[PDB]
Write a protein that binds this ligand. Structure first.
Ligand code: HEM
Ligand code: HEM
Ligand SMILES: CCOC(=O)N1CCC(Nc2cc(C)ccn2)CC1
Ligand SMILES: CCOC(=O)N1CCC(Nc2cc(C)ccn2)CC1
Ligand SMILES: C[C@H](O)[C@H](O)[C@H]1CNc2nc(N)[nH]c(=O)c2N1
Ligand SMILES: C[C@H](O)[C@H](O)[C@H]1CNc2nc(N)[nH]c(=O)c2N1
Ligand SMILES: [Zn+2]
Lengths: 416, 416
């Protein structure tokens, strides 16, 4: 009937019934980063009608089933219209309102997202009429400008044309809209973001000119209508960055660190009512730890931990001194302080965690559940200090949903 | 053939084949604290021979199969001897060496234990001849004394009589050998460990005299041969405690905090070759965060976070200031500093994490796998700063294994 869920801090009990609406096979492989169950791969043929129609009906029912006061007539009319469109065209087009509803629901259904309390606040850019890479670039620039909003970050998503036969997919090869390059220097050292070494080389191979800087914004690698990807530099005027300063340590700015203000996932696929949108970049605003802990402290990223430790005069040669804990916290403080001082939206991980708890509470009350991946929801630092750490959660895949995809360079058939 | 596992920090890839030897049904319910798959409940009848014999053979094969130079003759002889013992008695007795091997393997197979690099270093106390509660108490006192070793903590396990028909189970009702009481005071405030309020009341109901202190060591509630549980106060001379001091903040000792040196799990069940040992308390040494973060900072425990924040002069009314991160770290420092100064064994979470990574590496090389529960292995603070956070892991149940049990007070049939 339902799965019992407990919060080991408050003792509160919740009953999950929403998981019954979960889809296909899932994964215990809970700590796997990219499992097949969260990935929706490529196709070389259209979606079978016997599969598409049932999913379409289900979605249309969910949509009309979300209104406070039902519109029975339109409901049946839409069901009929969709069926006919599927029989006569082999697929169907969502109405703008249906699409907007789908993007918000997919967000609402993202298990790894801690900011879902904001799920109903999302700007949707309809680019389903897009046809060329140049046009893709223009839509993306518009999105970046709208979302950045001079520091007052706004959540948005741009929806490109849905997959047809799988041979004309629109795809952004970048993992994020804004990301820094990584270079293997002559002296053997790595400059910039070490995690983007390969993609940076790809951009260079495609004609992009390397600048060999520590923070060079990568170009957009856009694939339109299944054609070979084209490279487009992002106009620097559209990239807002925050220079890192510490409220007490004057020497922190000496590190010469900075980061972009816009966190945007560029390579996921939106699944809705049987349809698949391979290109749908979206953004929210940053949670401090993403930059302060992952970008700056991951060893395979900018890895500034030891340097900050020395500057603080800590015993960086004695793990037990907990110098790493002291350093990472001052870095997190620098990040929050800098974004705040420069009037750029950002939320600390404690506030975000409490924010998600309220949302989870609202969700179980509203629809009896909230798909959640504990492993991704607990912040990278101060785990049990946040309420989410003590909350049991159920992870499942609903629909609409945002899926991972197989890296395009691994499946793309080049024209030349 | 094998499951691919990746470390997102080093990029290293591992192949898991050991999971094939996993047992019954498991649980995505990865973040559930006490799932049925990790629990081995009570019985009212002996283990069916058709089930017991196969498990017994399997274990005996594993045992003789662990020697560098095989002893084929003894192997077959033991297999024969066990079968005959099962046919003639309905069960069988493990040899001392088999038991020792079983306890270490169960530890080796504990997915939620970060200290498994020490798996082969374990003292085993054979109390399978035990018959009364008083004798249980004596064995437990011997264990506590041996393990504490004046501060130089030694890992040990005491094995009581195996389950026969399920009506004569030996059980320690306590969750841990050493734990502090919790009291609901007249003015409505809670004194001591809030998480033990119920168990404390149980002890009081059984005759134990409450002292109403902040750190009153709870008595042992021992069930022998299926009889009603008897209460035994632990001789104070056997309980080593560490008074909490901070290396810089003189005011920290003013908090009047202390904690016990011995971390001992008292209520789990050891499963081996078809046999079940409902009473087998074991101990290792503490990892700093258990006390510094969970005991002292969990809101439903001693909850000292805010008080420490004020004393540090932090902005405890502004979450974004990250005052909680600063406070918890100084508390962790106090814990490590105090244990060290008082010459009591303890390991910080960074060293422990690296320790486990080395172990995991050894395990995949030695037997192609290492059952691991990421959710329990990543420390409660500084998650991604530790290497374990970036390591994909596979969680499965092997045999021998340490299982949870249904709380005894929920299934016990009182004589009076
Ligand atoms: C409003 C502010 C928002 C905040 C603060 C927030 C925060 C986060 C954080 C911290 C992560 C973890 C990223 C990582 O560790 O790589 C995440 C993941 C995710 N977010 Fe949100 N989010 C917000 C808005 C959005 C929006 C607008 C959408 C979609 C419409 C969304 C969709 C997702 C998805 C699908 C993931 C998983 C990404 C992956 O698996 O790599 N988020 N979010
Ligand atoms: C040598 C030092 C050891 C260290 C530092 C270590 C550390 C830990 C830690 C930190 C936990 C988490 C406890 C919690 O969060 O409640 C744990 C759990 C566990 N440990 Fe170890 N351990 C050690 C020795 C042992 C020994 C000797 C055994 C058994 C023979 C063992 C069996 C387990 C088991 C079964 C669990 C899971 C307990 C549960 O699920 O509640 N450990 N250990
Ligand atoms: C390692 C580079 O990481 C990133 O560029 N990002 C980190 C991962 C991802 N974060 C996000 C995404 C969203 C949509 C909202 C808040 N935070 C996008 C930005
Ligand atoms: C909340 C009370 O917690 C405890 O008494 N403990 C915390 C949980 C458990 N920790 C352990 C157990 C072992 C065997 C080794 C190291 N650490 C036993 C001690
Ligand atoms: C192996 C493990 O799945 C990996 O390190 C995880 C842990 N939790 C995470 N949580 C978030 N939010 N983002 C991440 O990239 C990761 N990576
Ligand atoms: C809900 C969740 O399972 C619970 O809070 C967990 C998280 N990780 C843990 N990890 C350890 N080591 N010990 C714990 O008690 C817990 N509790
Ligand atoms: Zn699972």
């Amino acid at each position: 009937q339902y799965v019992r869920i407990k919060n080991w801090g408050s003792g509160e009990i919740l009953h999950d019934t929403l998981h019954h609406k979960a889809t296909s096979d899932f994964t215990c492989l809970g700590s796997i980063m990219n499992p097949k169950s969260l990935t929706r791969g490529p196709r070389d043929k259209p979606t079978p009608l016997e599969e598409l129609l049932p999913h379409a009906i289900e979605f249309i029912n969910q949509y009309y089933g979300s209104f406070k006061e039902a519109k029975i007539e339109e409901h049946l009319a839409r069901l009929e219209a969709v069926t006919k469109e599927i029989e006569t065209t082999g697929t169907y087009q969502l109405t703008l309102d249906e699409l907007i509803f789908a993007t918000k629901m997919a967000w609402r259904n993202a298990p790894r997202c801690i900011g879902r309390i904001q799920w109903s606040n999302l700007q949707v850019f309809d680019a389903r009429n897009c046809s060329t890479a140049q046009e893709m670039f223009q839509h993306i620039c518009r999105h970046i400008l709208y979302a950045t909003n001079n520091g007052n970050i706004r959540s948005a998503i741009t929806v490109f044309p849905q997959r047809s036969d799988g041979k004309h997919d629109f795809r952004l090869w970048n993992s994020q809209l804004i990301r820094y390059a990584g270079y293997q220097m002559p002296d053997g050292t790595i400059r910039g973001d070490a995690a983007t070494l390969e993609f940076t080389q790809l951009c260079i191979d495609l004609g992009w000119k390397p600048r060999y800087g520590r923070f060079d914004v990568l170009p957009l690698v856009l694939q339109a209508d299944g054609q070979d990807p084209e490279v487009f530099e992002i106009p620097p005027d559209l990239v807002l960055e925050v220079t890192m300063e510490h409220p007490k340590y004057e020497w922190f700015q000496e590190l010469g660190l900075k980061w972009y203000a816009l966190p945007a996932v560029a390579n996921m696929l939106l699944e809705v009512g049987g349809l698949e949108f391979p290109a749908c970049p979206f953004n929210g605003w940053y949670m401090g730890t993403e930059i302060g802990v992952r970008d700056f402290c991951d060893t395979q990223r900018y890895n500034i931990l030891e340097e900050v430790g020395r500057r603080m005069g800590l015993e960086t040669h004695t793990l037990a001194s907990l110098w790493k804990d002291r350093a990472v916290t001052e870095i997190n403080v620098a990040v929050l302080h800098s974004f705040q001082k420069q009037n750029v939206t950002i939320m600390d991980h404690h506030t975000a965690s409490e924010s998600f708890m309220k949302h989870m509470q609202n969700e179980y009350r509203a629809r009896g559940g909230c798909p959640a991946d504990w492993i991704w929801l607990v912040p990278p630092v101060s785990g049990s200090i946040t309420p989410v750490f003590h909350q049991e959660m159920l992870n499942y895949v609903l629909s609409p949903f945002y899926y991972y995809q197989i890296e395009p360079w691994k499946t793309h058939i080049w024209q030349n």
